[PDB]
Short mmCIF file of C-alpha atoms in Angstrom, two decimals:
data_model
loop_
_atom_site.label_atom_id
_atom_site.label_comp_id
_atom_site.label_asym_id
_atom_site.label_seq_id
_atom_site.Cartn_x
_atom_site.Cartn_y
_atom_site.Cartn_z
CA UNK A 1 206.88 31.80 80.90
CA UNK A 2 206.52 31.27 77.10
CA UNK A 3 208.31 30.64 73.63
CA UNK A 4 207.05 33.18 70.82
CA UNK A 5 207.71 34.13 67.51
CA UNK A 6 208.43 37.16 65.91
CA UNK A 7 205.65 38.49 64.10
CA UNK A 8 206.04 37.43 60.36
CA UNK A 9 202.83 39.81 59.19
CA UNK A 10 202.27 43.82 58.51
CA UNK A 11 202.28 46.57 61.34
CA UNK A 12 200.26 49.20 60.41
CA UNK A 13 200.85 52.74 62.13
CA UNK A 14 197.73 53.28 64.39
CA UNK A 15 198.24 56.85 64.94
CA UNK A 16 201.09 59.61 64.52
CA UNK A 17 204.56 59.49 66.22
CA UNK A 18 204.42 61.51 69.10
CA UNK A 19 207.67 62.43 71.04
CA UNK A 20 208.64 62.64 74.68
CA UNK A 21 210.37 65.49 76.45
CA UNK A 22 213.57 63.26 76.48
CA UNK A 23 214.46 62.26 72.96
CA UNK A 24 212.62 59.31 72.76
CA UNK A 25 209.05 58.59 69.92
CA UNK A 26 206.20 56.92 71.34
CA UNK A 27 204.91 54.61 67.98
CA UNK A 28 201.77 53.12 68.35
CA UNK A 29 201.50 50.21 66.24
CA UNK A 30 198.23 47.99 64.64
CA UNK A 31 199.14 44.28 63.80
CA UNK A 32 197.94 42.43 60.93
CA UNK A 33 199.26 39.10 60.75
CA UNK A 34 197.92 35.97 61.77
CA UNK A 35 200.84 34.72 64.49
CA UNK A 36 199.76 36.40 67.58
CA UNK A 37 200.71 35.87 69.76
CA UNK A 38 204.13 37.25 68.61
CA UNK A 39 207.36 39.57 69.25
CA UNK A 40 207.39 42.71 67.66
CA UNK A 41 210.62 43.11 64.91
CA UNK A 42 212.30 46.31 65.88
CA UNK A 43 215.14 48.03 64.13
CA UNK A 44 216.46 51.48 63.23
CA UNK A 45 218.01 51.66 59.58
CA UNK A 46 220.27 54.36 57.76
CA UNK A 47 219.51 57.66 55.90
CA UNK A 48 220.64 55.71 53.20
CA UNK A 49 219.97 52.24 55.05
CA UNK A 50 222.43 50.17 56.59
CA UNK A 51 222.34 49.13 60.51
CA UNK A 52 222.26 52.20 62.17
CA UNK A 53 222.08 52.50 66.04
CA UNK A 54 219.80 53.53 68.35
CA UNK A 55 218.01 52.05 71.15
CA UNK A 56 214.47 50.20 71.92
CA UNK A 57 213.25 51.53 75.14
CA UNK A 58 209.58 49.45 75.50
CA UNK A 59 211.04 46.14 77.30
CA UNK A 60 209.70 43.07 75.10
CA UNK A 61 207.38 44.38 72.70
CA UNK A 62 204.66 41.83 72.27
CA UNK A 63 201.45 41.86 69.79
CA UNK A 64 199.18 39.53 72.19
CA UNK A 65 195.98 40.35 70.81
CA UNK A 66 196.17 41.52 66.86
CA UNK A 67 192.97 43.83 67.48
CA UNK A 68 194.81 45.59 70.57
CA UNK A 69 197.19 48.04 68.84
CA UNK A 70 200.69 48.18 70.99
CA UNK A 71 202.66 50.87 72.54
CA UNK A 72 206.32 50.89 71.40
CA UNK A 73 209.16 53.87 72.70
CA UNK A 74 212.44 53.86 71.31
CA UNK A 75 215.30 56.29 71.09
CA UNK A 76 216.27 56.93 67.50
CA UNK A 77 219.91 58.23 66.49
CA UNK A 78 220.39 61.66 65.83
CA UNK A 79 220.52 62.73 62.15
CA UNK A 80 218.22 60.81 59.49
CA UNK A 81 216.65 57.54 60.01
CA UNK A 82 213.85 54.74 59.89
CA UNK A 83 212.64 53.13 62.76
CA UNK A 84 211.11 50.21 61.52
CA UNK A 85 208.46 47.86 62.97
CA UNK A 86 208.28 44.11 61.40
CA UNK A 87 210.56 42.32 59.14
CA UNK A 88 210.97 42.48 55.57
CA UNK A 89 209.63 44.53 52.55
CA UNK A 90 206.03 44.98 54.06
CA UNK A 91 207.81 46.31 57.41
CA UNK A 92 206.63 49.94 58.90
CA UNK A 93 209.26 52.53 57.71
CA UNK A 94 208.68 55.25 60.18
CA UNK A 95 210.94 58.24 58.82
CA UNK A 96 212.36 60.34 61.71
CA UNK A 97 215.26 63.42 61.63
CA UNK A 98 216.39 64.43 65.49
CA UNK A 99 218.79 67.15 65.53
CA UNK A 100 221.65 68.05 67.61
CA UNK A 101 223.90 65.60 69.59
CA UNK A 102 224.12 64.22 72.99
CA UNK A 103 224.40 66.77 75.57
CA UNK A 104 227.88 66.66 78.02
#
């Protein structure tokens, strides 16, 4: 065991969002700060910002190698909003809509 930081630098989006048969993205993320090893920021913001729920799936997302992109699944809320990757201005805004409502 270890005692990180969370990554202070840009994410980059490696690839496009891709999403699972269950309501859940698969974000693929590229790193491009200098504090690696580091924990990956995660949040999911409002249609019009604000602290909107939702859920991270991926365990402990870690950058460990800033040339090794990382893997990153998370449940978004339904309607309109960002799931964003990092902290501050500078963090990855992904812009996502998923329709409907939970089911029973």
């Amino acid at each position: 065991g270890m005692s990180y930081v969370m990554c202070t630098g840009s994410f980059k989006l490696e690839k496009e969002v891709a999403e699972t048969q269950h309501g859940t993205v698969l974000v693929q993320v590229k790193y491009e700060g200098t504090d690696a090893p580091c924990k990956i920021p995660f949040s999911t913001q409002d249609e019009k910002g604000a602290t909107q729920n939702g859920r991270l799936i991926t365990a402990n997302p870690i950058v460990t190698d800033k040339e090794k992109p990382v893997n990153i699944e998370a449940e978004p809320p339904f309607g309109e909003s960002y799931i964003v990757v990092g902290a501050g201005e500078k963090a990855l805004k992904l812009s996502w809509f998923k329709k409907g409502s939970s089911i029973g």
